[PDB]
PDB file of C-alpha atoms and ligand atoms in Angstrom:
ATOM      1  CA  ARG A 667     -68.836  31.383  65.841  1.00  0.00           C
ATOM      2  CA  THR A 668     -68.799  31.982  62.059  1.00  0.00           C
ATOM      3  CA  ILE A 669     -66.056  30.342  59.984  1.00  0.00           C
ATOM      4  CA  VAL A 670     -64.652  32.069  56.884  1.00  0.00           C
ATOM      5  CA  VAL A 671     -64.568  29.670  53.932  1.00  0.00           C
ATOM      6  CA  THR A 672     -62.463  30.852  51.012  1.00  0.00           C
ATOM      7  CA  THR A 673     -63.384  29.518  47.575  1.00  0.00           C
ATOM      8  CA  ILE A 674     -63.209  30.401  43.890  1.00  0.00           C
ATOM      9  CA  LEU A 675     -65.669  31.114  41.073  1.00  0.00           C
ATOM     10  CA  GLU A 676     -65.095  28.020  38.939  1.00  0.00           C
ATOM     11  CA  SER A 677     -68.017  26.082  37.465  1.00  0.00           C
ATOM     12  CA  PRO A 678     -69.448  23.671  38.314  1.00  0.00           C
ATOM     13  CA  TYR A 679     -67.818  23.943  41.764  1.00  0.00           C
ATOM     14  CA  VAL A 680     -68.935  27.476  42.631  1.00  0.00           C
ATOM     15  CA  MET A 681     -71.151  29.600  40.399  1.00  0.00           C
ATOM     16  CA  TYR A 682     -73.539  32.531  40.813  1.00  0.00           C
ATOM     17  CA  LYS A 683     -77.203  31.585  41.046  1.00  0.00           C
ATOM     18  CA  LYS A 684     -79.246  33.059  38.184  1.00  0.00           C
ATOM     19  CA  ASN A 685     -80.733  35.789  40.417  1.00  0.00           C
ATOM     20  CA  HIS A 686     -77.655  36.331  42.593  1.00  0.00           C
ATOM     21  CA  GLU A 687     -77.734  40.137  42.291  1.00  0.00           C
ATOM     22  CA  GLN A 688     -80.992  40.100  44.249  1.00  0.00           C
ATOM     23  CA  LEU A 689     -79.507  37.781  46.898  1.00  0.00           C
ATOM     24  CA  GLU A 690     -77.042  37.972  49.783  1.00  0.00           C
ATOM     25  CA  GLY A 691     -74.529  35.874  51.687  1.00  0.00           C
ATOM     26  CA  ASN A 692     -74.146  32.208  50.810  1.00  0.00           C
ATOM     27  CA  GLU A 693     -77.452  32.263  48.876  1.00  0.00           C
ATOM     28  CA  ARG A 694     -75.665  33.972  45.975  1.00  0.00           C
ATOM     29  CA  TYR A 695     -73.774  30.795  45.082  1.00  0.00           C
ATOM     30  CA  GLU A 696     -74.465  27.211  44.007  1.00  0.00           C
ATOM     31  CA  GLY A 697     -72.389  24.234  42.887  1.00  0.00           C
ATOM     32  CA  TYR A 698     -70.476  21.126  43.898  1.00  0.00           C
ATOM     33  CA  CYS A 699     -68.270  22.920  46.445  1.00  0.00           C
ATOM     34  CA  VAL A 700     -71.189  24.935  47.816  1.00  0.00           C
ATOM     35  CA  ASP A 701     -73.014  21.654  48.484  1.00  0.00           C
ATOM     36  CA  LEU A 702     -69.828  20.093  49.865  1.00  0.00           C
ATOM     37  CA  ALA A 703     -69.283  23.051  52.180  1.00  0.00           C
ATOM     38  CA  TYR A 704     -72.866  22.593  53.400  1.00  0.00           C
ATOM     39  CA  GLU A 705     -72.380  18.854  54.003  1.00  0.00           C
ATOM     40  CA  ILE A 706     -69.113  19.294  55.907  1.00  0.00           C
ATOM     41  CA  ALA A 707     -70.478  22.114  58.067  1.00  0.00           C
ATOM     42  CA  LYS A 708     -73.322  19.826  59.096  1.00  0.00           C
ATOM     43  CA  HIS A 709     -70.890  17.162  60.321  1.00  0.00           C
ATOM     44  CA  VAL A 710     -68.366  19.514  61.917  1.00  0.00           C
ATOM     45  CA  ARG A 711     -71.308  21.569  63.202  1.00  0.00           C
ATOM     46  CA  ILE A 712     -70.205  25.130  62.425  1.00  0.00           C
ATOM     47  CA  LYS A 713     -71.659  28.298  60.926  1.00  0.00           C
ATOM     48  CA  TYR A 714     -69.767  29.619  57.907  1.00  0.00           C
ATOM     49  CA  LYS A 715     -69.602  32.409  55.359  1.00  0.00           C
ATOM     50  CA  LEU A 716     -68.471  31.737  51.800  1.00  0.00           C
ATOM     51  CA  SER A 717     -65.977  34.245  50.435  1.00  0.00           C
ATOM     52  CA  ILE A 718     -64.796  34.271  46.826  1.00  0.00           C
ATOM     53  CA  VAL A 719     -61.045  34.840  46.973  1.00  0.00           C
ATOM     54  CA  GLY A 720     -60.081  38.373  45.963  1.00  0.00           C
ATOM     55  CA  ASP A 721     -57.394  37.724  43.350  1.00  0.00           C
ATOM     56  CA  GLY A 722     -59.343  34.814  41.859  1.00  0.00           C
ATOM     57  CA  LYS A 723     -56.292  32.519  42.018  1.00  0.00           C
ATOM     58  CA  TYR A 724     -55.773  29.013  43.380  1.00  0.00           C
ATOM     59  CA  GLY A 725     -52.424  29.459  45.082  1.00  0.00           C
ATOM     60  CA  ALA A 726     -48.721  29.814  44.404  1.00  0.00           C
ATOM     61  CA  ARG A 727     -45.722  31.332  46.173  1.00  0.00           C
ATOM     62  CA  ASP A 728     -44.188  34.276  44.333  1.00  0.00           C
ATOM     63  CA  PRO A 729     -40.453  33.475  43.886  1.00  0.00           C
ATOM     64  CA  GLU A 730     -39.802  37.189  44.440  1.00  0.00           C
ATOM     65  CA  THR A 731     -41.560  38.254  47.638  1.00  0.00           C
ATOM     66  CA  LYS A 732     -42.025  34.605  48.665  1.00  0.00           C
ATOM     67  CA  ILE A 733     -45.618  35.561  49.459  1.00  0.00           C
ATOM     68  CA  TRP A 734     -48.494  33.135  48.839  1.00  0.00           C
ATOM     69  CA  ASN A 735     -51.425  34.351  46.748  1.00  0.00           C
ATOM     70  CA  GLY A 736     -54.804  32.823  45.970  1.00  0.00           C
ATOM     71  CA  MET A 737     -56.793  30.700  48.398  1.00  0.00           C
ATOM     72  CA  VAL A 738     -53.575  29.210  49.755  1.00  0.00           C
ATOM     73  CA  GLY A 739     -52.510  32.710  50.773  1.00  0.00           C
ATOM     74  CA  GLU A 740     -55.831  33.380  52.477  1.00  0.00           C
ATOM     75  CA  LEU A 741     -55.235  30.402  54.797  1.00  0.00           C
ATOM     76  CA  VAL A 742     -51.512  31.033  55.332  1.00  0.00           C
ATOM     77  CA  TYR A 743     -52.022  34.656  56.441  1.00  0.00           C
ATOM     78  CA  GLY A 744     -55.104  33.856  58.502  1.00  0.00           C
ATOM     79  CA  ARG A 745     -57.802  35.544  56.414  1.00  0.00           C
ATOM     80  CA  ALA A 746     -59.796  32.313  56.027  1.00  0.00           C
ATOM     81  CA  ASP A 747     -60.388  29.287  58.277  1.00  0.00           C
ATOM     82  CA  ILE A 748     -61.126  26.701  55.572  1.00  0.00           C
ATOM     83  CA  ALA A 749     -60.934  26.429  51.795  1.00  0.00           C
ATOM     84  CA  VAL A 750     -63.476  24.282  49.973  1.00  0.00           C
ATOM     85  CA  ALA A 751     -62.672  24.272  46.267  1.00  0.00           C
ATOM     86  CA  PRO A 752     -60.981  22.207  43.557  1.00  0.00           C
ATOM     87  CA  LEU A 753     -57.584  22.843  45.179  1.00  0.00           C
ATOM     88  CA  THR A 754     -55.018  20.212  44.216  1.00  0.00           C
ATOM     89  CA  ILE A 755     -53.056  18.493  46.986  1.00  0.00           C
ATOM     90  CA  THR A 756     -49.366  19.129  46.215  1.00  0.00           C
ATOM     91  CA  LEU A 757     -46.098  18.898  48.145  1.00  0.00           C
ATOM     92  CA  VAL A 758     -45.346  22.639  48.205  1.00  0.00           C
ATOM     93  CA  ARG A 759     -48.814  23.395  49.542  1.00  0.00           C
ATOM     94  CA  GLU A 760     -48.791  20.546  52.093  1.00  0.00           C
ATOM     95  CA  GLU A 761     -45.746  22.249  53.588  1.00  0.00           C
ATOM     96  CA  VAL A 762     -47.721  25.405  54.438  1.00  0.00           C
ATOM     97  CA  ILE A 763     -51.337  24.247  54.880  1.00  0.00           C
ATOM     98  CA  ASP A 764     -53.218  21.078  55.912  1.00  0.00           C
ATOM     99  CA  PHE A 765     -55.264  18.997  53.456  1.00  0.00           C
ATOM    100  CA  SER A 766     -58.031  16.505  54.160  1.00  0.00           C
ATOM    101  CA  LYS A 767     -57.829  13.178  52.319  1.00  0.00           C
ATOM    102  CA  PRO A 768     -59.079  13.759  48.752  1.00  0.00           C
ATOM    103  CA  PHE A 769     -62.804  14.136  48.029  1.00  0.00           C
ATOM    104  CA  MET A 770     -62.115  13.762  44.302  1.00  0.00           C
ATOM    105  CA  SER A 771     -59.428  12.025  42.229  1.00  0.00           C
ATOM    106  CA  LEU A 772     -58.117  13.436  38.935  1.00  0.00           C
ATOM    107  CA  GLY A 773     -55.186  14.343  36.701  1.00  0.00           C
ATOM    108  CA  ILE A 774     -53.856  16.842  34.168  1.00  0.00           C
ATOM    109  CA  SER A 775     -55.457  16.403  30.758  1.00  0.00           C
ATOM    110  CA  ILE A 776     -55.513  17.886  27.277  1.00  0.00           C
ATOM    111  CA  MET A 777     -58.438  19.869  25.897  1.00  0.00           C
ATOM    112  CA  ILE A 778     -58.711  20.423  22.145  1.00  0.00           C
ATOM    113  CA  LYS A 779     -61.257  21.952  19.814  1.00  0.00           C
ATOM    114  CA  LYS A 780     -62.906  18.977  18.054  1.00  0.00           C
ATOM    115  CA  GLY A 781     -61.075  17.978  14.883  1.00  0.00           C
ATOM    116  CA  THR A 782     -57.637  19.092  16.074  1.00  0.00           C
ATOM    117  CA  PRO A 783     -54.875  16.628  15.011  1.00  0.00           C
ATOM    118  CA  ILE A 784     -53.619  15.952  18.548  1.00  0.00           C
ATOM    119  CA  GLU A 785     -54.054  12.758  20.555  1.00  0.00           C
ATOM    120  CA  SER A 786     -51.334  12.946  23.219  1.00  0.00           C
ATOM    121  CA  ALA A 787     -48.778  15.121  24.993  1.00  0.00           C
ATOM    122  CA  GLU A 788     -46.139  13.697  22.641  1.00  0.00           C
ATOM    123  CA  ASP A 789     -48.099  15.019  19.667  1.00  0.00           C
ATOM    124  CA  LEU A 790     -48.128  18.527  21.128  1.00  0.00           C
ATOM    125  CA  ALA A 791     -44.422  18.464  21.965  1.00  0.00           C
ATOM    126  CA  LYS A 792     -43.255  17.412  18.485  1.00  0.00           C
ATOM    127  CA  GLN A 793     -44.984  20.242  16.611  1.00  0.00           C
ATOM    128  CA  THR A 794     -45.256  24.033  16.677  1.00  0.00           C
ATOM    129  CA  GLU A 795     -48.325  24.866  14.581  1.00  0.00           C
ATOM    130  CA  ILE A 796     -50.678  24.331  17.526  1.00  0.00           C
ATOM    131  CA  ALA A 797     -50.064  26.483  20.594  1.00  0.00           C
ATOM    132  CA  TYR A 798     -50.866  25.291  24.122  1.00  0.00           C
ATOM    133  CA  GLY A 799     -50.879  26.541  27.696  1.00  0.00           C
ATOM    134  CA  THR A 800     -52.071  26.152  31.282  1.00  0.00           C
ATOM    135  CA  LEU A 801     -53.691  28.182  34.051  1.00  0.00           C
ATOM    136  CA  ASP A 802     -51.396  30.640  35.818  1.00  0.00           C
ATOM    137  CA  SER A 803     -50.479  30.373  39.519  1.00  0.00           C
ATOM    138  CA  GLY A 804     -51.519  26.753  40.000  1.00  0.00           C
ATOM    139  CA  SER A 805     -50.498  23.126  40.370  1.00  0.00           C
ATOM    140  CA  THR A 806     -50.647  22.399  36.640  1.00  0.00           C
ATOM    141  CA  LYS A 807     -48.078  25.046  35.728  1.00  0.00           C
ATOM    142  CA  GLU A 808     -45.857  23.771  38.555  1.00  0.00           C
ATOM    143  CA  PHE A 809     -46.182  20.219  37.217  1.00  0.00           C
ATOM    144  CA  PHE A 810     -44.614  21.233  33.910  1.00  0.00           C
ATOM    145  CA  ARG A 811     -42.079  23.587  35.479  1.00  0.00           C
ATOM    146  CA  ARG A 812     -40.887  20.755  37.736  1.00  0.00           C
ATOM    147  CA  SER A 813     -41.109  17.683  35.485  1.00  0.00           C
ATOM    148  CA  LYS A 814     -37.992  15.659  34.689  1.00  0.00           C
ATOM    149  CA  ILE A 815     -39.870  13.682  32.034  1.00  0.00           C
ATOM    150  CA  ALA A 816     -38.548  14.438  28.540  1.00  0.00           C
ATOM    151  CA  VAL A 817     -41.885  15.069  26.842  1.00  0.00           C
ATOM    152  CA  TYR A 818     -42.982  17.443  29.626  1.00  0.00           C
ATOM    153  CA  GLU A 819     -39.639  19.238  29.891  1.00  0.00           C
ATOM    154  CA  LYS A 820     -40.033  19.930  26.177  1.00  0.00           C
ATOM    155  CA  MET A 821     -43.535  21.355  26.594  1.00  0.00           C
ATOM    156  CA  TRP A 822     -42.410  23.535  29.500  1.00  0.00           C
ATOM    157  CA  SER A 823     -39.490  24.901  27.484  1.00  0.00           C
ATOM    158  CA  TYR A 824     -41.988  25.987  24.824  1.00  0.00           C
ATOM    159  CA  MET A 825     -44.689  27.437  27.111  1.00  0.00           C
ATOM    160  CA  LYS A 826     -42.148  29.238  29.274  1.00  0.00           C
ATOM    161  CA  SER A 827     -41.172  31.527  26.401  1.00  0.00           C
ATOM    162  CA  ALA A 828     -44.334  31.689  24.274  1.00  0.00           C
ATOM    163  CA  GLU A 829     -45.425  35.022  22.774  1.00  0.00           C
ATOM    164  CA  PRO A 830     -48.019  36.101  23.445  1.00  0.00           C
ATOM    165  CA  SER A 831     -48.323  34.363  26.821  1.00  0.00           C
ATOM    166  CA  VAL A 832     -50.083  30.997  26.847  1.00  0.00           C
ATOM    167  CA  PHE A 833     -50.757  31.179  30.581  1.00  0.00           C
ATOM    168  CA  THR A 834     -54.321  32.240  31.362  1.00  0.00           C
ATOM    169  CA  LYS A 835     -55.670  33.855  34.517  1.00  0.00           C
ATOM    170  CA  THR A 836     -58.762  31.632  34.554  1.00  0.00           C
ATOM    171  CA  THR A 837     -60.005  28.318  33.217  1.00  0.00           C
ATOM    172  CA  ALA A 838     -62.637  30.229  31.252  1.00  0.00           C
ATOM    173  CA  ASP A 839     -60.003  32.218  29.358  1.00  0.00           C
ATOM    174  CA  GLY A 840     -58.212  29.035  28.370  1.00  0.00           C
ATOM    175  CA  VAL A 841     -61.445  27.460  27.164  1.00  0.00           C
ATOM    176  CA  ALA A 842     -62.459  30.608  25.277  1.00  0.00           C
ATOM    177  CA  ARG A 843     -59.067  30.674  23.556  1.00  0.00           C
ATOM    178  CA  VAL A 844     -59.409  27.016  22.542  1.00  0.00           C
ATOM    179  CA  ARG A 845     -62.851  27.714  21.086  1.00  0.00           C
ATOM    180  CA  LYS A 846     -61.867  30.781  19.070  1.00  0.00           C
ATOM    181  CA  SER A 847     -58.477  29.397  18.012  1.00  0.00           C
ATOM    182  CA  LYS A 848     -60.083  27.238  15.333  1.00  0.00           C
ATOM    183  CA  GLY A 849     -57.846  24.379  16.422  1.00  0.00           C
ATOM    184  CA  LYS A 850     -54.645  26.374  16.950  1.00  0.00           C
ATOM    185  CA  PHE A 851     -54.733  26.352  20.751  1.00  0.00           C
ATOM    186  CA  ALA A 852     -54.892  23.361  23.083  1.00  0.00           C
ATOM    187  CA  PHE A 853     -55.405  23.792  26.818  1.00  0.00           C
ATOM    188  CA  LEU A 854     -53.936  21.803  29.718  1.00  0.00           C
ATOM    189  CA  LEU A 855     -56.292  21.524  32.679  1.00  0.00           C
ATOM    190  CA  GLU A 856     -57.441  18.944  35.183  1.00  0.00           C
ATOM    191  CA  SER A 857     -59.739  16.175  33.915  1.00  0.00           C
ATOM    192  CA  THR A 858     -62.635  17.257  36.145  1.00  0.00           C
ATOM    193  CA  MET A 859     -62.899  20.584  34.293  1.00  0.00           C
ATOM    194  CA  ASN A 860     -62.176  19.074  30.889  1.00  0.00           C
ATOM    195  CA  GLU A 861     -64.910  16.486  31.469  1.00  0.00           C
ATOM    196  CA  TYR A 862     -67.413  19.157  32.518  1.00  0.00           C
ATOM    197  CA  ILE A 863     -66.750  21.397  29.493  1.00  0.00           C
ATOM    198  CA  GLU A 864     -67.138  18.525  27.010  1.00  0.00           C
ATOM    199  CA  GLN A 865     -70.730  18.240  28.233  1.00  0.00           C
ATOM    200  CA  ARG A 866     -71.593  21.918  27.752  1.00  0.00           C
ATOM    201  CA  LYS A 867     -72.868  23.664  24.622  1.00  0.00           C
ATOM    202  CA  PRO A 868     -71.651  24.410  22.007  1.00  0.00           C
ATOM    203  CA  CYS A 869     -69.979  21.032  22.616  1.00  0.00           C
ATOM    204  CA  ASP A 870     -66.993  21.964  20.443  1.00  0.00           C
ATOM    205  CA  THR A 871     -64.162  20.657  22.618  1.00  0.00           C
ATOM    206  CA  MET A 872     -63.094  17.236  23.867  1.00  0.00           C
ATOM    207  CA  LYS A 873     -60.592  15.588  26.195  1.00  0.00           C
ATOM    208  CA  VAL A 874     -57.933  13.601  24.343  1.00  0.00           C
ATOM    209  CA  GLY A 875     -55.677  10.863  25.641  1.00  0.00           C
ATOM    210  CA  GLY A 876     -55.345   9.701  29.224  1.00  0.00           C
ATOM    211  CA  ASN A 877     -54.353  11.909  32.143  1.00  0.00           C
ATOM    212  CA  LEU A 878     -50.743  12.992  32.582  1.00  0.00           C
ATOM    213  CA  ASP A 879     -50.711  12.205  36.319  1.00  0.00           C
ATOM    214  CA  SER A 880     -52.937  11.119  39.222  1.00  0.00           C
ATOM    215  CA  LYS A 881     -53.773  13.270  42.207  1.00  0.00           C
ATOM    216  CA  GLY A 882     -56.652  14.684  44.189  1.00  0.00           C
ATOM    217  CA  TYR A 883     -58.457  17.689  45.615  1.00  0.00           C
ATOM    218  CA  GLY A 884     -58.569  18.258  49.346  1.00  0.00           C
ATOM    219  CA  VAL A 885     -60.430  20.553  51.738  1.00  0.00           C
ATOM    220  CA  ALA A 886     -57.685  22.760  53.192  1.00  0.00           C
ATOM    221  CA  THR A 887     -57.117  24.397  56.589  1.00  0.00           C
ATOM    222  CA  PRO A 888     -54.308  26.437  58.171  1.00  0.00           C
ATOM    223  CA  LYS A 889     -51.434  24.252  59.379  1.00  0.00           C
ATOM    224  CA  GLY A 890     -52.216  22.876  62.825  1.00  0.00           C
ATOM    225  CA  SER A 891     -55.827  24.099  62.867  1.00  0.00           C
ATOM    226  CA  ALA A 892     -58.299  22.328  65.147  1.00  0.00           C
ATOM    227  CA  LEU A 893     -60.744  21.944  62.261  1.00  0.00           C
ATOM    228  CA  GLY A 894     -58.367  19.668  60.365  1.00  0.00           C
ATOM    229  CA  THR A 895     -59.284  16.411  62.107  1.00  0.00           C
ATOM    230  CA  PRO A 896     -63.094  16.920  62.129  1.00  0.00           C
ATOM    231  CA  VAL A 897     -63.051  18.005  58.478  1.00  0.00           C
ATOM    232  CA  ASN A 898     -61.004  15.020  57.389  1.00  0.00           C
ATOM    233  CA  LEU A 899     -63.287  12.535  59.121  1.00  0.00           C
ATOM    234  CA  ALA A 900     -66.265  14.367  57.609  1.00  0.00           C
ATOM    235  CA  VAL A 901     -64.782  13.996  54.122  1.00  0.00           C
ATOM    236  CA  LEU A 902     -64.237  10.275  54.678  1.00  0.00           C
ATOM    237  CA  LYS A 903     -67.762   9.875  56.061  1.00  0.00           C
ATOM    238  CA  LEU A 904     -69.250  11.622  53.009  1.00  0.00           C
ATOM    239  CA  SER A 905     -67.092   9.439  50.771  1.00  0.00           C
ATOM    240  CA  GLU A 906     -68.248   6.252  52.533  1.00  0.00           C
ATOM    241  CA  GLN A 907     -71.923   7.206  52.305  1.00  0.00           C
ATOM    242  CA  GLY A 908     -71.597   7.857  48.591  1.00  0.00           C
ATOM    243  CA  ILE A 909     -72.528  11.533  48.993  1.00  0.00           C
ATOM    244  CA  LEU A 910     -69.507  12.653  46.982  1.00  0.00           C
ATOM    245  CA  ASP A 911     -70.610  10.459  44.085  1.00  0.00           C
ATOM    246  CA  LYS A 912     -74.141  11.818  44.247  1.00  0.00           C
ATOM    247  CA  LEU A 913     -72.771  15.366  43.936  1.00  0.00           C
ATOM    248  CA  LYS A 914     -70.589  14.557  40.955  1.00  0.00           C
ATOM    249  CA  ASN A 915     -73.568  13.063  39.145  1.00  0.00           C
ATOM    250  CA  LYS A 916     -75.635  16.137  40.039  1.00  0.00           C
ATOM    251  CA  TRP A 917     -73.269  18.821  38.782  1.00  0.00           C
ATOM    252  CA  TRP A 918     -71.602  17.002  35.881  1.00  0.00           C
ATOM    253  CA  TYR A 919     -73.882  14.486  34.169  1.00  0.00           C
ATOM    254  CA  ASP A 920     -77.380  15.408  35.342  1.00  0.00           C
ATOM    255  CA  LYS A 921     -76.709  18.717  33.595  1.00  0.00           C
ATOM    256  CA  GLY A 922     -75.079  17.304  30.455  1.00  0.00           C
ATOM    257  CA  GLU A 923     -75.949  18.903  27.109  1.00  0.00           C
ATOM    258  CA  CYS A 924     -73.947  16.902  24.574  1.00  0.00           C
TER     259      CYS A 924
HETATM  260  C1  LIG B2112     -59.511  23.677  38.634  1.00  0.00           C
HETATM  261  C2  LIG B2112     -58.227  23.574  37.878  1.00  0.00           C
HETATM  262  O1  LIG B2112     -58.352  23.031  36.612  1.00  0.00           O
HETATM  263  N1  LIG B2112     -57.060  22.974  35.973  1.00  0.00           N
HETATM  264  C3  LIG B2112     -56.314  23.485  36.912  1.00  0.00           C
HETATM  265  O2  LIG B2112     -55.004  23.654  36.809  1.00  0.00           O
HETATM  266  C4  LIG B2112     -56.926  23.890  38.135  1.00  0.00           C
HETATM  267  C5  LIG B2112     -56.245  24.498  39.348  1.00  0.00           C
HETATM  268  C6  LIG B2112     -55.617  23.428  40.287  1.00  0.00           C
HETATM  269  N2  LIG B2112     -56.700  22.499  40.764  1.00  0.00           N
HETATM  270  C7  LIG B2112     -54.883  24.078  41.517  1.00  0.00           C
HETATM  271  O3  LIG B2112     -55.262  23.751  42.652  1.00  0.00           O
HETATM  272  O4  LIG B2112     -53.957  24.884  41.287  1.00  0.00           O
HETATM  273 ZN1  LIG B2113     -74.786  37.729  37.067  1.00  0.00          ZN
HETATM  274 ZN1  LIG B2114     -74.034  14.262  55.005  1.00  0.00          ZN
END
């Protein structure tokens, strides 16, 4: 019947259409993941309903209750059948949900307000004047928390006990902080987002240095779900036909402003 697709409000993946308040259902949203959801549904041949995840989080297991939140939690506890969003494929998640092969490749990167004297992770680690942070409850924070690499262990030790907190609830909050910090706050987010922001007015931020790692985003389904196989082949098909590239051009560069 109708599949529940959990996703998250994160531009340019999923955003409200200009006149969304006068709309209903899937028509309220637009973006890369909305188009991707549409393309996959066509191949897997299913009817679906997009649902912005309640807590607005990507997904992490609370060390306390051991309960999964975010979109990951929606799949784990059976409140959603599929998740189409910029959800990073990681080991801890692979253990509780299934991931299609990646539909996009990326890595953790550094975002600075233009003019900031920072060109690498090493630069951030060896100073204290400029504060930095990452999104809360996601793969990026876990990367730093788990790294055995000196430079990253150093950054984690600083972010872990920063006051006030340097962990934001959304990508937008991180970006806003970078913009109003007048160069005193750098943000650590995936290259896809960093690249998108650089191309959006007021064009006051930029990605510096190369990525810190290499990974990908995958369409996720509950562990053992029957949709896993069809969805994975659909992702590969769309990759082969260059549809995924068309969509990146559409939502990133066709709409550039800098
Ligand atoms: C998007 C995005 O951009 N930077 C990030 O850390 C994220 C969230 C990350 N893709 C996750 O799945 O947790
Ligand atoms: Zn609105
Ligand atoms: Zn297609």
